[PDB]
Amino acid sequence: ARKRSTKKLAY
Amino acid sequence: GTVNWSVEDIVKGINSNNLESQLQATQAARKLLSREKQPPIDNIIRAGLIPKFVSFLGKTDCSPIQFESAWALTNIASGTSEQTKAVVDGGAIPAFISLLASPHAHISEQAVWALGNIAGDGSAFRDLVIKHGAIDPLLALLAVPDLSTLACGYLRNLTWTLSNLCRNKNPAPPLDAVEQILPTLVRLLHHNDPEVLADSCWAISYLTDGPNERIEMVVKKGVVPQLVKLLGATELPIVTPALRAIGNIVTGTDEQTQKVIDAGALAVFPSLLTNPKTNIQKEATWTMSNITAGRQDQIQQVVNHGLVPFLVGVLSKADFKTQKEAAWAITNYTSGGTVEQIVYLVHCGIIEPLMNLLSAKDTKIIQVILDAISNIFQAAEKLGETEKLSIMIEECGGLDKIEALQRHENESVYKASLNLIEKYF
């Protein structure tokens, strides 16, 4: 019972 | 005019001491770098043009060359980490920050875009953009009474750049920067544009991906109800980040999970746990597994919303990763649940799919299933109904799987199967 845990080009 | 230039001609134009020739050559470079098929970024860098573009960023009396150079540098910074680094090494960060306050909206938007790329490279350049003082001018651009007055593309770009400022870990963004950004992020989370909403949810999901103190920073702003509302949206690009943020939040303390529950989140999970997009099902089942690891009253709220049958369904048929998340959810349920809750789980038909999953090759899911079965057997022991549970497991064909796992390579599976067979079979 334990909890478990970009870029852009301008065209 | 400025279409299909060679880097040689661009260099000759930029090297001339004629500002108009420089402007035309910079526009030609922008057009080269804005082409969809392999833009020649490395050639432009090797030509030594980044310092010239950075210098042009400061030509206040020639706004067109400011815009063209900002566009070219944006597209250079959109590439690999080495190319973004080449942009940063030219001194572009302070120049773009100075352009944020330009009276020309398209130049300011281009600077926002470029800073977004630079910060999106990673935590180092993110924190460096923050250190140069970008947050204040960025947020000042959104200091309007009604966001609807702003241009749609401008607002979307600002939101995306802020999301990149909230992005990445090891280290996470500075606490003071997060506190400075959060109010504008809440305001944007209440905006009506789908892309702005999606990027705001992504920012929130970044900010909630960390220790409970970061999650607490987020939840004290009162965003959980809006996140639940967006969780029930029709646009998948909105539901995905909203669901990620809700899952991150429920990875925290029991009180934060309870804030998620009180906002009505569970009512959405009948659809999420049956969503046709496998990613949504996986994320929702992981979120459920983290909710079932909470208090017994929270498990009871899961029961009251009729979600146990949906977990049985996901366990019976789904992508294997989703089925493994469901196995984890069942094991947490059985670990923290009351005897009544566990017998209810059994009455919903969990044993047969839980046993059919023992045929998998993954060892971790097998161990999780064996732990869940051990917990169920413990509840039955407290009820004196272990023989009925054993008969049920035998009719499903699970005893065969367990006695076969007695010959498993892993030590934990070996020992758990042997313990089960020695104590109940």
Residue numbers in the entry:
A (entry chain B): 21 to 25, 29 to 34
B (entry chain A): 72 to 496
Question: What did the published study say regarding this structure?
Answer:
The MERS-CoV ORF4b protein is a viral accessory protein that functions as an innate immune inhibitor and strongly localizes to the nucleus, despite virus replication occurring exclusively within the cytoplasmic compartment. Here we provide a detailed, structural basis for the interaction between MERS-CoV ORF4b and its innate immune suppression target, the nuclear import adapter IMPα.
The structure of a MERS-CoV ORF4b Arg33 to Ala (R33A) mutant bound to IMPα2 showed a change in the major site binding register similar to that of R24A, with Lys30 positioned at the P2 site, with minor site binding retained. D An Arg33Ala mutation, depicted as above, caused a change in binding at the major site to the canonical P2 Lys binding. From this quantitative experiment, we determined that R24A at the minor site binding region and R33A at the major site binding region both reduced IMPα2 binding to the greatest extent, with binding affinities of 238 nM (significant ~20-fold reduction compared to WT; one-way ANOVA followed by Tukey’s test, p = 0.0002) and 471 nM (significant ~40-fold reduction compared to WT; one-way ANOVA followed by Tukey’s test, p < 0.0001), respectively. Because we were unable to obtain similar structural data for an IMPα:p65 complex, we examined the ability of MERS ORF4b to inhibit NF-κB p65 nuclear import during a TNFα response and found a marked reduction in nuclear import of this subunit. Consistent with the above data, the R33A mutant was significantly impaired in its inhibition of p65 nuclear import compared to WT ORF4b.
